[PDB]
Design an enzyme around this catalytic site. Sequence first.
Site, mmCIF file in Angstrom:
data_model
loop_
_atom_site.group_PDB
_atom_site.id
_atom_site.type_symbol
_atom_site.label_atom_id
_atom_site.label_comp_id
_atom_site.label_asym_id
_atom_site.label_seq_id
_atom_site.Cartn_x
_atom_site.Cartn_y
_atom_site.Cartn_z
ATOM 1 N N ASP A 1 -9.444 -2.766 1.695
ATOM 2 C CA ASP A 1 -8.975 -1.750 0.736
ATOM 3 C C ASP A 1 -7.710 -2.224 0.034
ATOM 4 O OD1 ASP A 1 -8.820 0.603 -0.775
ATOM 5 O OD2 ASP A 1 -8.191 1.847 0.916
ATOM 6 N N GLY B 1 -2.858 12.199 7.896
ATOM 7 C CA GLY B 1 -1.545 12.586 8.392
ATOM 8 C C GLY B 1 -0.401 12.544 7.404
ATOM 9 N N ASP C 1 -1.314 -0.118 4.425
ATOM 10 C CA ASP C 1 -2.592 0.572 4.583
ATOM 11 C C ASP C 1 -3.565 -0.216 5.469
ATOM 12 O OD1 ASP C 1 -4.638 2.491 4.068
ATOM 13 O OD2 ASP C 1 -5.483 1.123 2.559
ATOM 14 N N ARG D 1 -2.129 0.726 -4.977
ATOM 15 C CA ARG D 1 -1.720 1.948 -4.272
ATOM 16 C C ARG D 1 -1.450 1.695 -2.792
ATOM 17 N NH1 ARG D 1 -7.091 2.493 -5.297
ATOM 18 N NH2 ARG D 1 -8.406 2.143 -3.460
ATOM 19 N N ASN D 2 -1.997 0.605 -2.267
ATOM 20 C CA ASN D 2 -1.945 0.343 -0.828
ATOM 21 C C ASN D 2 -0.991 -0.787 -0.476
ATOM 22 O OD1 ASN D 2 -3.764 2.366 -0.115
ATOM 23 N ND2 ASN D 2 -5.529 1.032 -0.499
ATOM 24 N N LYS E 1 4.678 8.485 10.830
ATOM 25 C CA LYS E 1 3.441 9.158 10.492
ATOM 26 C C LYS E 1 2.815 9.840 11.696
ATOM 27 C CE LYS E 1 -0.909 8.623 8.061
ATOM 28 N NZ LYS E 1 -1.829 7.679 7.395
ATOM 29 N N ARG F 1 1.824 11.577 2.074
ATOM 30 C CA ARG F 1 0.683 12.305 2.593
ATOM 31 C C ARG F 1 -0.524 11.404 2.538
ATOM 32 N NH1 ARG F 1 1.740 18.170 1.440
ATOM 33 N NH2 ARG F 1 3.860 18.190 0.560
ATOM 34 N N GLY F 2 -1.186 11.258 3.673
ATOM 35 C CA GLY F 2 -2.483 10.621 3.686
ATOM 36 C C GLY F 2 -3.467 11.647 4.191
HETATM 37 F F1 LIG Z 1 1.558 8.054 -3.208
HETATM 38 C C1 LIG Z 1 1.386 7.191 -2.192
HETATM 39 C C2 LIG Z 1 0.474 6.159 -2.312
HETATM 40 C C3 LIG Z 1 0.301 5.264 -1.265
HETATM 41 C C4 LIG Z 1 1.031 5.412 -0.099
HETATM 42 C C5 LIG Z 1 0.856 4.528 0.966
HETATM 43 C C6 LIG Z 1 0.069 3.372 0.818
HETATM 44 N N1 LIG Z 1 -0.087 2.528 1.867
HETATM 45 C C7 LIG Z 1 0.519 2.824 3.066
HETATM 46 N N2 LIG Z 1 0.528 2.145 4.268
HETATM 47 N N3 LIG Z 1 1.295 2.860 5.130
HETATM 48 C C8 LIG Z 1 1.760 3.945 4.482
HETATM 49 C C9 LIG Z 1 2.641 5.035 5.043
HETATM 50 F F2 LIG Z 1 2.131 6.229 4.718
HETATM 51 F F3 LIG Z 1 2.680 4.897 6.369
HETATM 52 C C10 LIG Z 1 4.056 4.927 4.531
HETATM 53 C C11 LIG Z 1 4.851 3.850 4.926
HETATM 54 C C12 LIG Z 1 6.164 3.739 4.477
HETATM 55 C C13 LIG Z 1 6.688 4.746 3.614
HETATM 56 N N4 LIG Z 1 7.986 4.642 3.160
HETATM 57 C C14 LIG Z 1 8.517 5.571 2.333
HETATM 58 C C15 LIG Z 1 7.757 6.666 1.911
HETATM 59 C C16 LIG Z 1 6.437 6.804 2.338
HETATM 60 C C17 LIG Z 1 5.903 5.803 3.216
HETATM 61 C C18 LIG Z 1 4.563 5.910 3.683
HETATM 62 N N5 LIG Z 1 1.271 3.924 3.202
HETATM 63 N N6 LIG Z 1 1.447 4.802 2.146
HETATM 64 C C19 LIG Z 1 1.943 6.447 0.024
HETATM 65 C C20 LIG Z 1 2.124 7.334 -1.026
#
Ligand SMILES: Fc1ccc(-c2cnc3nnc(C(F)(F)c4ccc5ncccc5c4)n3n2)cc1
Length: 288
Positions: free
Chosen positions: A150, A36, A168, A154-155, A56, A32-33
């Site tokens: 950023d 989205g 991110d 976390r990113n 996403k 979750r962001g």
């Molecule tokens: F608790 C958290 C903390 C950070 C993030 C995070 C950080 N940077 C990102 N850049 N793109 C994404 C994203 F949402 F598209 C993404 C990309 C691959 C994934 N693979 C598997 C599961 C979730 C995914 C989420 N993030 N997400 C997500 C959760």
Amino acid sequence: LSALNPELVQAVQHVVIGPSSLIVHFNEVIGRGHFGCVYHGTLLDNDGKKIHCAVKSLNRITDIGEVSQFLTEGIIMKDFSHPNVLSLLGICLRSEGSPLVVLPYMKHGDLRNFIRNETHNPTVKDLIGFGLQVAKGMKYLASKKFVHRDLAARNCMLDEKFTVKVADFGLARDMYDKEYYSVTGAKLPVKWMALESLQTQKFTTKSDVWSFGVLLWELMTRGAPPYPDVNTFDITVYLLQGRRLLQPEYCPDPLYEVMLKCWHPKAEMRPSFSELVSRISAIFSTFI
Ligand SMILES: Fc1ccc(-c2cnc3nnc(C(F)(F)c4ccc5ncccc5c4)n3n2)cc1
């Protein structure tokens, strides 16, 4: 969508994934962001092989100009390619949940949650290794003159081979943990920001180097929040007083020296990412 400039549509053609190539499992949110939710999906390559995807679905798009900039950003993002940077697989326009950003699935999630997980024991060497991987991804981004703005644990994400990906950015840009942002309408990751950025809200590759130092500190503490006893609104004066994050218990001296260098008050005196890759490689090699 028929209202888009046709030349922009043609320009983005190579980034587009047709809905007949994509299966998205919209019933379970995997991340979750603010802007989205993310779902698991499978993308079919031309060989018919399955690629696991994080898909996403962007919210809060209201006008054609936003759609147009979305496409424009997809184009530049598609051009980035490095093993320590998150790739854009494509975007899906002709779908429910459109527009969909299709990214590689990151089995081990975000780096910060990964290192905080008590059930595994990354070694000090492993943790320095993650930092080295981040430095390599940043070295690449900086070589293309891209400023992340950023960078934080976390990113960054971790795939099934424990490859760290700086994430991110581009179409994946979001706030994924709102606890660390203060809201130009600028949402600011205050505790990762360089002194000059806090003062002027200007960002450069050298301000990314500052954030990288904080990221190293996160790694060496296995995901402790930086400056826990300092309120968000008080960080700028804290730094101006000549204070810095303390050396973590298991952080080797040369790495703390690297951190300190990243937080030099003069941006030009901070190391480059190329220098960080070389020095951290050396430090990494001394363990085990
Ligand atoms: F608790 C958290 C903390 C950070 C993030 C995070 C950080 N940077 C990102 N850049 N793109 C994404 C994203 F949402 F598209 C993404 C990309 C691959 C994934 N693979 C598997 C599961 C979730 C995914 C989420 N993030 N997400 C997500 C959760």
